[PDB]
Amino acid sequence: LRDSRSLRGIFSSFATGVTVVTVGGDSPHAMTANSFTSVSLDPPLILVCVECDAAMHGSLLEVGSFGVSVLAADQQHVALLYANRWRPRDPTQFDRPGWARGARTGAPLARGALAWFECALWRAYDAGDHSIFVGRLLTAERHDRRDALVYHSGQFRGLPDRA
């Protein structure tokens, strides 16, 4: 239980979709998250868990709102990039055609995603080495159903789906 590689392994038995959480503002940023969870319908709430030592932890608190893009299976590379701590953190990357801007927050939203969310930060709860960020939905939108990106047993997987 004290071993990270082992415990991460047990955790990996639970399959997930994959998202990219984003902020806009002066210093736009993006990161890959699979801790995304639908929480409540009234009021409409979701949550994500972000490492305390991660840059997005501070950005979320600074900006107070965020975007979420649920990734299709052909967006594995997007998932990989924004999980990469060594990545370019340059705001120019979000001006590329692969990004849309949320109508409500201006947060980057990944084109081709299965779905988009914009949220206002409702609360941030302590949770050990992570914090639980609860967002109240401002906008939400589902796109064409197609194969979904899935993360299971530490592997990226494609989940077939069609309307």
Ligand X SMILES: Cc1cc2nc3c(=O)[nH]c(=O)nc-3n(C[C@H](O)[C@H](O)[C@H](O)COP(=O)(O)OP(=O)(O)OC[C@H]3O[C@@H](n4cnc5c(N)ncnc54)[C@H](O)[C@@H]3O)c2cc1C
- Whether the CB-CB separation of 108 and 100 falls below 8 Å is answered with yes
124 lines the binding site for ligand X (CB under 6 A): no
Select from 115, 131, 113, 111 the least CA-distant residue to 123.
Answer: 131
57 lines the binding site for a second copy (CB under 8 A): no
As measured in angstroms, the least distance from the Cβ of 160 to ligand X is 18
Is 119 annotated as ligand-binding?
no
39 lines the binding site for ligand X (CB under 6 A): no
80 lines the binding site for a second copy (CB under 8 A): no
Binding partner of 77, given ligand X, a second copy, none, CB within 5-8 angstroms per partner class:
none
Q: Which stretch in 53-61, 78-86, 98-106, 133-141 sits in contact with a second copy by CB under 8 A?
A: 133-141
Select from 132, 106, 115 the least CA-distant residue to 52.
Answer: 132
132 lines the binding site for a second copy (CB under 8 A): yes
Pairwise CA distance, residues 66 & 105, whole Å: 7
- Whether the CB-CB separation of 73 and 161 falls below 8 Å is answered with no
Site for a second copy in 9-28 (CB under 8 A): 9-11, 13-17, 19
Q: What is the largest CA-CA distance in the chain?
A: 44
The DSSP letter of residue 74 is G
The DSSP letter of residue 147 is P
Q: Would you give the distance in Å from CA 51 to the centre of its chain?
A: 13
- List residues forming the annotated binding site for FAD: 29, 32, 34-35, 49, 51, 55-56, 83, 87, 89
Site residues (vs a second copy, CB under 8 A): 1, 4, 7-11, 13-17, 19, 35-47, 49, 70, 114-115, 117, 123, 125, 127-130, 132, 134, 137, 139-142, 145, 148, 150, 152-153, 157, 159, 161
